[PDB]
Amino acid sequence: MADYLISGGTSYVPDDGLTAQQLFNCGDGLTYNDFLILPGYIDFTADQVDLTSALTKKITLKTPLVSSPMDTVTEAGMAIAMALTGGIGFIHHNCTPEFQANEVRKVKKYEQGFITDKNRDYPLASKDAKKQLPCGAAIGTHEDDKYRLDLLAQAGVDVVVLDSSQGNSIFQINMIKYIKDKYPNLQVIGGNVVTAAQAKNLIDAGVDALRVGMGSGSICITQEVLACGRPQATAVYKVSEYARRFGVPVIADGGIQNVGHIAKALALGASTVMMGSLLAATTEAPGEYFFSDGIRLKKYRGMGSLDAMDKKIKVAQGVSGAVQDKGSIHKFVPYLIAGIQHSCQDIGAKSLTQVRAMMYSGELKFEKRTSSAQVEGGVHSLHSYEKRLF
Amino acid sequence: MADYLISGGTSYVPDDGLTAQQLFNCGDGLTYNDFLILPGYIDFTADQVDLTSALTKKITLKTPLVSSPMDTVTEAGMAIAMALTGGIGFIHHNCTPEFQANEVRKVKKYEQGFITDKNRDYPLASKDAKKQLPCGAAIGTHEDDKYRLDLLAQAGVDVVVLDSSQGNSIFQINMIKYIKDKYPNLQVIGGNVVTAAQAKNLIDAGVDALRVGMGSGSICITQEVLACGRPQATAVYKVSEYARRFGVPVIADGGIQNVGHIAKALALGASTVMMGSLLAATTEAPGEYFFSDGIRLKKYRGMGSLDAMDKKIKVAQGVSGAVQDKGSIHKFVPYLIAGIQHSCQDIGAKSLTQVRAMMYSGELKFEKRTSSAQVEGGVHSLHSYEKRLF
Amino acid sequence: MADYLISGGTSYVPDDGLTAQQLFNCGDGLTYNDFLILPGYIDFTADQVDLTSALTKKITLKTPLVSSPMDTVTEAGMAIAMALTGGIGFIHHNCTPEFQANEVRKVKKYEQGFITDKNRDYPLASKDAKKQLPCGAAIGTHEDDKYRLDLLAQAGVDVVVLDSSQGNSIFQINMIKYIKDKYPNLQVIGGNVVTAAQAKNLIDAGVDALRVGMGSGSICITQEVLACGRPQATAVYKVSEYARRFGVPVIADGGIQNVGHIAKALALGASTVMMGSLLAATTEAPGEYFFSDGIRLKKYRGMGSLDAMDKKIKVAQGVSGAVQDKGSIHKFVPYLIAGIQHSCQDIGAKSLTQVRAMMYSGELKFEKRTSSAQVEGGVHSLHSYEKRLF
Amino acid sequence: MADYLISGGTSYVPDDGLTAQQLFNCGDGLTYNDFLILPGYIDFTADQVDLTSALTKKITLKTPLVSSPMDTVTEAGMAIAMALTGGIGFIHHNCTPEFQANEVRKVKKYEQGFITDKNRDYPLASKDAKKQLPCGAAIGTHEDDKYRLDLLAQAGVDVVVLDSSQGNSIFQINMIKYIKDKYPNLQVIGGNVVTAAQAKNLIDAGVDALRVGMGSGSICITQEVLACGRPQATAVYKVSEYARRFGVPVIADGGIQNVGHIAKALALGASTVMMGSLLAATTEAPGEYFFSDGIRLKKYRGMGSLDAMDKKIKVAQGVSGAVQDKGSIHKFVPYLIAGIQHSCQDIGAKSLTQVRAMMYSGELKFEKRTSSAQVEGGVHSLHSYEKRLF
Ligand SMILES: NC(=O)c1ccc[n+]([C@@H]2O[C@H](COP(=O)([O-])OP(=O)(O)OC[C@H]3O[C@@H](n4cnc5c(N)ncnc54)[C@H](O)[C@@H]3O)[C@@H](O)[C@H]2O)c1
Ligand SMILES: NC(=O)c1ccc[n+]([C@@H]2O[C@H](COP(=O)([O-])OP(=O)(O)OC[C@H]3O[C@@H](n4cnc5c(N)ncnc54)[C@H](O)[C@@H]3O)[C@@H](O)[C@H]2O)c1
Ligand SMILES: NC(=O)c1ccc[n+]([C@@H]2O[C@H](COP(=O)([O-])OP(=O)(O)OC[C@H]3O[C@@H](n4cnc5c(N)ncnc54)[C@H](O)[C@@H]3O)[C@@H](O)[C@H]2O)c1
Ligand SMILES: NC(=O)c1ccc[n+]([C@@H]2O[C@H](COP(=O)([O-])OP(=O)(O)OC[C@H]3O[C@@H](n4cnc5c(N)ncnc54)[C@H](O)[C@@H]3O)[C@@H](O)[C@H]2O)c1
Ligand SMILES: *c1nc2c(ncn2[C@@H]2O[C@H](COP(=O)(O)O)[C@@H](O)[C@H]2O)c(=O)[nH]1
Ligand SMILES: *c1nc2c(ncn2[C@@H]2O[C@H](COP(=O)(O)O)[C@@H](O)[C@H]2O)c(=O)[nH]1
Ligand SMILES: *c1nc2c(ncn2[C@@H]2O[C@H](COP(=O)(O)O)[C@@H](O)[C@H]2O)c(=O)[nH]1
Ligand SMILES: *c1nc2c(ncn2[C@@H]2O[C@H](COP(=O)(O)O)[C@@H](O)[C@H]2O)c(=O)[nH]1
């Protein structure tokens, strides 16, 4: 019959909104708050949404959440918490290599299979072949980072991130090739990059994932000091679009402030999301809580801040501050998971993989927001209010 | 793994060419020769291509070919031949109603099941419930056409076409409602229309298919005489795009000169293709062969030509001429079928339904042709040549 | 082989971002904060970046930094400091000609070769043929400015700037020709201009450099009072693009607030950058430090402010205020130098000359910033923070 | 020779910026702060700029300044002051007709020629044939306004303005025709209008000038309450462009905050500028000065405010407030005159007539301003400052 024979199941579906390609073709320099995702069709419940994510070519996580390698964010405690909730943590390298290797060992010795030296309480916990938690580590691109890498490999790190503001450098590519030849099984994350040209240079060197973002971080002043960077949403879309031609996952790094930002980054092509300030002042973050006028808060600083580089003339690229206490990771990360699942349900996708497939196929639709639209989208017209997320 | 998890099976597939929507958004006023279909991916053979087509809401044919209701094209002989090759013929009404009903009866009595008054030699032959060939008939929108319709319904016609140059009229809509209430099972084809506004008016009246085309016919001079019409490719695309919102098939009528034109019309949203000149001077066309300077050819005239309307000032809308002999329908239609199948294979679709699904989804891609491109596409740079299609 | 023969060394390099010409063709009226420079490829260290800059046709400096001719900014002390750090200072003329000539003499007698009447402590110090520091001076376009010019030429000034808000005037052109005929060796800077038409008029008169900017200065209210001016980034790009057709350097004047602004101005085609407020409240700036509620700060006023013109009815074009203490030039200018070098390294250029060559060739790429993008580029999501640049 | 024969005196003059027609074709909905005028060529001094302006077809003023018919702005004192400084005042009608006629008489009896029962202290003072100051008056479009008009005509008013928010009404057109037939010599100003369609309706009725502006006034809330209006700069340009086809002058009404705004309105096609808040809290404004926390200020209210309409259900269209004391008109208006003259000198025109001629010919050029550009154009980067206009 005609109702089937005219177009074969694919029905009318009025065209309304912009595709991602149309949205990011305009060259406006958009970030997360400049656009929304239009809703789709719902025929399933939120709890059925699958958040399985690729961290690298060969490392898969049950959630897309990653803690940033920052000395005020990720040490062994935070890494264990993120592994237990289904993500991963990357241990910072603003320390001695022995200290870093000890932190990696503490992460890797939390759970064991056959000890050669709880699984039910944490179903989403990611594990390697030997029933051990996964762990990540940051290294630089200088000469001593080779010895640091040897210690980390001995400690049993599963993935290393090359920590730099501008990853498209001869130093970074040289260390990528060094690692590829000396530890052929080790997974390497390159970055940070914001353009497809940088991305091509790093993928040709053989990275297993790309870290995307420059200047969007909450503690960053790189854009205003060095005049270099890119709006985060455009950067994530462009680099993910390039990298998926070669099957390279993208980690979206910097500027994430809420669940909506996480969902937008995943919809734009990122496979995982890296969080700094959002996970600072949690119980598992390193450092100690302190009070400033009846407010509980913790230190949070950028790695390019003068205090961070203290332990010639130094050009600071980050600031040092404090953020309000958020509580425990074991209570905060489930809220993020539920929020992402609800966002996926609203846009009509059963999984993050299907979200990205719909985006690349043009089925997922977007819309811009003017300044008035953003104000309307926020809380308005109230004398006073209380905001309780969960 | 990441190779699956990044976008879920849907690979890169570099973007190249225009979608049909993009092509017909430019407002250039394109017809068939102004564009091409870009090739796709082939993983099947040409003979496996399915050409099942919807003529109306409830009438399905094995091929998309229809013979036009013209007194130099379709009588009982042509109708039987087209039914036997898998299409259908529409018997013209430039005759008395008794003559038309007799032609319909001759078509409907060619093959029988249980005669109440070969099926393997012609596998593609379309048949109704009682194993009889299908037949179509044209009627006008004047008062006496009701009596003509009664005679045709008694003769057992399966579908009637309302024959007019401009179908968006109060007369046509009145007769559509008359037919709907008096013969609730009879299928009605409305037209001719070239715009979505006309199409909406006719679909609201309850037609089961639309006949699309005004001024594109080979014998027609309506565009130059009445300044009204539309380029055929744009008309087919626009009207099919509107009509498929309601599950109404479109017959593309006029200006078809070759297999490439048939394939283009089907790719643009038409479900069947109506042919005039292409089927004139076949053996089954009415009239007798005659010679003019060693060339065998037959009369072919437009219904709005003065000779056609002869049997008060008449404004002619068509010319009368002759076309070269093509041979038999039973040998010519298989060539068209094979050509359409090869076109479908080249663009990478298993069926006409899938062709249209790909076009509406944006997977099928198109390209414009300049005048130099069209010349290049034709035969060139030769001293002399012979063109043998089959 | 094909890897070389296909395109000869020039590899793919995916296209991403806008060229400067594309960015400033849109007519949006951009200034510095509306765009960023995308990062390039790094294969050298920051300290290897060469900042040699052309102040005029024949005067070359080792850094691109120039102090503005303002009575709260540049006197002999500031001029000596800027000469010693590799730049130059322009002595203001809101004084008597004898006072100005004495300041020029004090600058020119700081270092000597063969005295006819430290080289290692300051390697970047600019010097003339006779091992003396270079010095600049401002003059007006009125009649007595000829006598002022005679005194300055006797004092041995190396370059004079014609000080005006709108340099495209018959008065300015007359004085330019006067100076060219009377002091054929003296270098003349014309301005201020913001359009290529003004620039053509001044280059035809024979200037050796152009001063670009109108209304962008921190103390300026010309745009709001006289409705005339231009956004600074667009002005710098347009005028530099015109002036380089004739080999005329451009000084970018006004609205510089940080190292990122300096880098952007140099990337847009300027050869040197003139600074007002950024160098006010340094130790070498004229005037005395004073306290307002525990904050140390110095007077800073525009030359078109009523206080400035006090020493008929006067239309003020500038305001008078105070800015916070910055410390010494000998410590602040090295920070600017290091910042510019780091910006050049990030965008992948070995020198300012190569930065501009990449920009004109289209290799350097830019990106716009929405308001949300600018907010994201700034410090955000923090309860409190401290910003220590160096 | 070729230097003349190639193009005949008209030289290259590089193309840079936008014409007014290009600027206002974009449909962005610009007001005064969204654009600047680019500078031109200066070959004359500021005092030589001629500000002669057409108020109506037959009434010419030496300055383009007009005081608004508002009960907190214009009574006899303000009307006399504006006439003496070269402009005109329009006496408000929120009073009895006898009171209004008495104010008109007080204005018309200030200076006399041959008294039927100083002119060198005020050279710019506008005068009629009998050496008397000109005076304007506002009337409504209701029935009793005819009697009010009779009293005003007897008092000797020279021009009447029809006071309404939306002037394109049958009531306004009826009163325009009434006035034209009963007082054939009286000059009538119609409005307020913001579109060319309204302008055509009023010009067809026979107005001698148009009052342009709806919702832009400082005390107005019409746009937010009735959703109707237009950005003032676009409104002035569009309506002036239409009205000059018929030789009808335009008064730009509302939203003027400074000299730059006046200059922009005149450059966009207006012949005179009407001022409300800018002239409120001057000594000559009606009402009494009063103090609020050490600040001297005066009442200023919109005519559509509830207090104004007090003396069944009233929809307020204006608010009531207070503005800071500005001093005397005799000192403030000369500042405006000098500012306008300086703006004309900067853009390179000898007169307002030549400003508009250059604008219509495309020689005058404009530029847009982003939000960052506007911030840059303002005062910035200062700890504190003092702004003394004159
Ligand atoms: N993502 C961001 O936007 C961002 C911005 C600023 C800082 N940061 C963080 O701050 C930290 C440091 O910043 P960075 O990017 O300057 O790190 P970095 O230490 O890589 O850079 C230091 C400098 O040394 C150079 N360098 C690097 N390797 C070298 C080698 N082998 N030989 C010679 N020179 C070499 C670099 O090009 C750079 O000029 C990192 O944690 C980084 O992630 C991040
Ligand atoms: N598709 C084309 O481009 C095209 C163009 C011209 C002619 N033709 C063919 O030629 C033939 C005649 O052309 P036509 O369209 O003029 O046919 P038509 O007979 O419908 O038109 C005849 C005229 O009579 C009017 N009319 C129709 N029904 C009426 C009624 N009940 N009462 C009063 N007036 C009425 C029509 O509006 C038209 O003016 C048809 O075969 C048509 O298919 C086709
Ligand atoms: N760059 C800017 O945006 C800007 C803006 C305002 C003021 N300023 C500074 O403030 C100071 C004020 O200078 P200015 O440009 O306001 O005015 P200026 O000192 O050049 O002269 C002011 C007026 O005198 C006229 N004039 C100049 N030379 C003349 C001559 N020979 N004969 C007759 N008339 C002549 C000018 O055209 C102008 O109307 C300067 O320091 C200037 O650099 C700079
Ligand atoms: N944007 C502006 O320029 C603006 C906006 C609001 C108010 N105002 C000022 O406030 C005052 C009043 O505003 P307004 O425009 O409502 O004045 P208005 O008195 O003309 O309007 C009063 C109402 O009566 C109607 N009306 C007018 N004449 C009539 C007649 N002869 N018969 C029947 N109905 C008639 C009008 O259409 C309107 O609905 C005026 O001073 C006006 O200038 C100005
Ligand atoms: C600029 N960016 C910096 C610096 N240190 C780290 N970073 C980047 O910021 C991310 C965290 O940002 P949040 O918005 O707080 O999530 C980090 O992951 C890293 O990429 C710095 O000093 N200057
Ligand atoms: C214009 N068009 C006419 C006329 N009679 C019929 N037609 C239309 O032409 C079609 C055939 O065109 P070909 O190109 O030869 O296939 C018919 O089906 C009909 O729609 C006429 O008089 N003037
Ligand atoms: C407007 N602009 C003025 C005035 N005096 C000087 N200037 C200009 O400003 C520049 C300094 O600006 P900063 O942003 O503080 O660097 C000067 O170099 C000069 O060009 C004035 O009165 N009104
Ligand atoms: C809206 N607009 C009103 C009202 N009364 C007068 N007006 C308009 O505003 C102009 C003055 O505006 P300023 O910006 O203060 O110069 C007047 O001339 C008139 O056109 C009102 O109640 N609501």
Curated annotation (Swiss-Prot), chains A, B, C, D:
This protein's GO CC annotations: cytoplasm; cytosol; extracellular exosome; extracellular region; ficolin-1-rich granule lumen; membrane; nucleus; peroxisomal membrane
Catalytic reactions on record: IMP + NAD(+) + H2O = XMP + NADH + H(+)
Residues the entry annotates as binding NAD(+): D163, S164, S165, G213, M214, G215
Cross-link named Glycyl lysine isopeptide (Lys-Gly) (interchain with G-Cter in SUMO2), sites: K314
Pfam family of the protein (one): CBS
EC numbers, comma separated: 1.1.1.205
GO MF terms, alphabetically ordered: DNA binding; IMP dehydrogenase activity; metal ion binding; nucleotide binding; RNA binding
Alphabetized CDD domains for the sequence: CBS_pair_IMPDH (cd04601), IMPDH (cd00381)
Tissue: IMPDH1 is the main species in normal leukocytes and IMPDH2 predominates over IMPDH1 in the tumor.
Entry-annotated residues carrying Phosphoserine: S305
Residues that hold K(+) according to the record: G215, G217, C220, E376, G377, G378
Induction (UniProt): Selectively up-regulated in neoplastic and replicating cells.
Phosphotyrosine modifications at: Y289
Subunit structure as annotated in this protein's UniProt entry: Homotetramer. Interacts with CLOCK; in a circadian manner. Interacts with ANKRD9; leading to its ubiquitination and degradation by the proteasome.
UniProt cross-references to PANTHER family, sorted A to Z: INOSINE-5'-MONOPHOSPHATE DEHYDROGENASE 2 (PTHR11911:SF121), INOSINE-5-MONOPHOSPHATE DEHYDROGENASE RELATED (PTHR11911)
Protein name as it appears in the record: Inosine-5'-monophosphate dehydrogenase 2
Encoding gene, per UniProt annotation: IMPDH2
